[PDB]
């Protein structure tokens, strides 16, 4: 096929031209720019709370914007809302399917979204009803052709972003269940997503089993920026708090930082002793620290700017599957295949 051969030659030509156009402005490395940032104090974080109640692997968690409530979901189909400060369970629902791989808290704090092997994402309201029946109030919003891997509310309770093993992400209207926009481009299962905290608020990033992280324009459905430097599946993605960079965690045992304004990978956080996959990443409030959970049951904490490991945290008795820093930056929560979550500070 001559047309195919010529197109591939043109695509490689443009790839190299783009590489060279970007390289012209790559005048410094992050470790050089950060040469004189102040050193960190002693690392002293420990487990403050252990949330016990799930009957099988914890797969996902999300903090409420109230800074203390947490939603978490399990392989056995159960979703729990905790007041993590007291450890009290406030809400509980069993989904009609197993492997609830995704859950999100609504910004109002009055709803949660979740799904997984059901190929859907559903919204449940949270109420102060005495004998609360959550299952009776399930609203199916998203429909994919394969499993849901990730979800998030946008900047309201009325819209939801999903990622799927079907290779797509999608934006949905909660009230109608209408597909607002599909995002096609990943070569394979999409595993994670995060909404950009930018002033514009028109983009999000996703990661998948094509080993790529892709930044999407929600208005057009187009991928505007793609990054392909990981050597295996991209399990987690997270914007740096200013919105001008994001981090990823991968099966390849590295976490990486990408500079969106210069359009370049700028840091690789890795050690020879760290050979198992990173499942989950999140930033401290200032973006100075990156917390990551790993398949070898540990958490590694990285100095984003200096590139060195700050600490390794032991405690979980199976994979760390999910990790979020709290909304006010005072703590972080890890969830694990050991059936538990921990809050650290």
């Amino acid at each position: 096929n001559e047309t195919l051969a010529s197109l591939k030659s043109e695509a490689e030509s443009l790839k190299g031209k783009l590489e060279e156009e970007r390289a012209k402005l790559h005048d410094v490395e992050l470790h050089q720019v950060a040469e004189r940032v102040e050193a960190l104090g002693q690392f002293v974080m420990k487990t403050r709370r252990t949330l016990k109640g799930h009957g099988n692997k914890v797969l996902c968690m999300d903090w409420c914007k109230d800074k203390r409530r947490i939603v978490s979901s399990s392989q056995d189909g159960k979703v729990i809302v905790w007041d993590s400060f007291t450890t009290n369970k406030e809400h509980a629902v069993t989904m009609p399917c197993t492997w609830v791989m995704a859950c999100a808290y609504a910004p109002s704090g009055c709803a949660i979204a979740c799904g997984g092997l059901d190929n859907k994402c559903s919204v449940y309201p949270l109420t102060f009803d005495k004998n609360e029946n959550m299952a009776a109030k399930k609203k199916s919003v998203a429909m994919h052709t394969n499993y849901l891997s990730a979800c998030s509310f946008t900047n309201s309770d009325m819209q939801i972003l999903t990622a799927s093993g079907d290779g797509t992400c999608a934006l949905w209207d909660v009230e109608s269940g209408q597909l607002l926009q599909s995002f096609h481009g990943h070569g394979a299962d999409v595993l994670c997503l995060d909404l950009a905290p930018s002033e514009t608020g028109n983009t999000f990033v996703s990661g998948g089993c094509d080993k790529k992280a892709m930044v999407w324009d929600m208005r057009s459905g187009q991928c505007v920026q793609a990054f392909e430097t990981h050597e295996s599946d991209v399990n987690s993605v997270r914007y740096y708090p200013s919105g001008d960079a994001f981090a990823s965690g991968s099966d390849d045992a590295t976490c990486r930082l990408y500079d969106l304004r210069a359009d370049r990978e700028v840091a690789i956080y890795s050690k020879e002793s760290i050979i198992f996959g990173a499942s989950s990443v999140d930033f401290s409030l200032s973006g100075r620290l990156l917390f990551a959970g790993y398949n070898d049951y540990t958490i590694n904490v990285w100095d984003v700017l200096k590139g060195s490991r700050v600490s390794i945290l032991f405690g979980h008795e199976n994979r760390v599957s999910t990790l979020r820093v709290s909304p006010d930056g005072t703590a972080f929560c890890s969830g694990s295949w050991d059936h538990t979550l921990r809050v650290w500070a």
Binding site: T3, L4, L30, F85, L260, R261, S286, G329
Partner: protein, 415 residues
């Protein structure tokens, strides 16, 4: 559903480490073998493997112990005594390297036919020298692969026959080696299945997929689009990142602590009480944070309320109302959008509007042309125009105003 095993990048990495350990000049210290055993490598102690890891990777004994444990759990190294205990003991306990034939693989799990052969063979070497769980497994397989059973038995008898040409020491050693494999791949109940990788994938990671024309065309489109986009020097963007983290450092409670204390550490909730979303009087830290950038002010409801008071005083108290209306249009209920878009235009933008605000000629034209076919992003240009105007003009003047200064002055200082 899902058909394919996921990528397992860790395997090659363990294998590289194991190869390093077996190096003749720099590998793990090995032991003599006064009894002649030809079928397996020489033994080594758990302590020596651990010391090698600690030294090679330059890490704490805790981290080396964790890693060493996984090398054993995955079956690359196995114990000669207490075999059910898949840890690397930091002592004189003996271990051997597993043969590569019995390493785990990304694409191929251990197969039921092979397990049946192993159990049928073991069954012959005793009557039921089989452990409880193994008897259950054997009975399960006798039913499940009933059709292969003549083959299973033939192969078991064949291997048993061949096993008898080894002397006592080799036979014992080979039996230990094979048992160590099956302990990992068909674990006793109540033992961790380290091989559990979660869900399978829809897409096969081992598929070398032929790119279609449509695929390459789409790749071309990405590059052409990307080449149209502007970037900045790394010194500029990275300088910004470093400065941002520096600016927010004192607000990062994990790094810097907080006042009066961290509720997670002391169980005192005052820090949360003082920083309630709609607290009457904000803390000084909070008011100071509004000065870091315009988004900090806008995203804080107390900050936005203060900023709105400033704007109303300057007769600009509809800009924020318009910005909020556009935010709701874009992110709210979509059954409404067409009507909502038209009503926002009529209320804020049209000549004689009852909440009139000014936008420049170009922005108005973009808006009016878009409104010929209303959609949820139809007011995006007007919204951005008004947001940037507030950011560029009003924000800095707000920070210089008596309104902000009085806010700073009355703000709570805890501790």
């Amino acid at each position: 559903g899902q058909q394919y095993r996921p990528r397992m990048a860790f395997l090659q990495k363990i294998e590289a480490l194991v190869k390093d350990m077996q190096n003749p000049e720099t590998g793990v210290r090995m032991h003599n073998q006064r009894v002649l055993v030809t079928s397996v490598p020489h033994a080594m102690t758990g302590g020596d493997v651990l010391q090698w890891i600690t030294q090679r990777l330059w890490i704490s004994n805790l981290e080396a112990q964790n890693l060493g444990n996984f090398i054993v759990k995955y079956g690359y190294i196995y114990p000669l005594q207490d075999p059910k205990n898949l840890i690397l003991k930091p002592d004189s306990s003996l271990y051997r390297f597993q043969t590569p034939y019995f390493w785990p693989t990304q694409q191929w799990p251990a197969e039921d036919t092979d397990y049946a052969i192993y159990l049928a063979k073991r069954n012959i070497k005793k009557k039921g020298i089989l452990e409880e769980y193994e008897k259950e497994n054997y009975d399960f397989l006798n039913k499940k692969i009933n059709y292969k059973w003549d083959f299973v038995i033939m192969q078991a008898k064949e291997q048993y026959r061949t096993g008898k040409e080894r002397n006592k020491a080799d036979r014992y050693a080979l039996d230990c080696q094979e048992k160590a494999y099956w302990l990992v791949h068909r674990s006793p109940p109540g033992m961790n299945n380290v091989l559990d990788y979660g869900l399978d994938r829809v897409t096969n990671p081992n598929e070398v997929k032929k790119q279609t024309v449509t695929a390459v065309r789409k790749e071309i489109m990405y590059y052409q689009q990307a080449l149209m986009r502007s970037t900045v020097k790394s010194s500029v963007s990275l300088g910004g990142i470093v400065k941002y983290s520096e600016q927010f450092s004192s607000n990062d409670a994990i790094m810097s602590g907080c006042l009066p204390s961290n509720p997670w550490i002391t169980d005192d909730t005052q820090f949360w009480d003082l920083n309630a979303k709609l607290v009457e009087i904000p803390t000084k830290m909070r008011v100071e944070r509004w000065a870091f950038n315009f988004s900090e002010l806008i995203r804080d409801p107390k900050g936005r309320q203060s900023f709105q008071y400033f704007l109303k005083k300057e007769f600009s108290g509809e800009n924020l109302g318009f910005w909020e209306a556009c935010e709701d249009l874009k992110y709210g209920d979509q059954s409404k959008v067409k009507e909502k878009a038209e009503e926002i235009y009529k209320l804020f933008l049209a000549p004689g509007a009852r909440r009139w605000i000014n936008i420049d000629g170009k922005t108005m034209d973009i808006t009016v042309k878009g409104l010929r076919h209303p959609h949820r992003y139809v007011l995006d240009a007007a919204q951005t125009h008004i947001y940037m105007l507030m950011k560029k003009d009003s924000y800095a003047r707000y920070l210089k105003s008596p309104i902000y200064k009085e806010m700073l002055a009355k703000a709570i200082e805890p501790q």
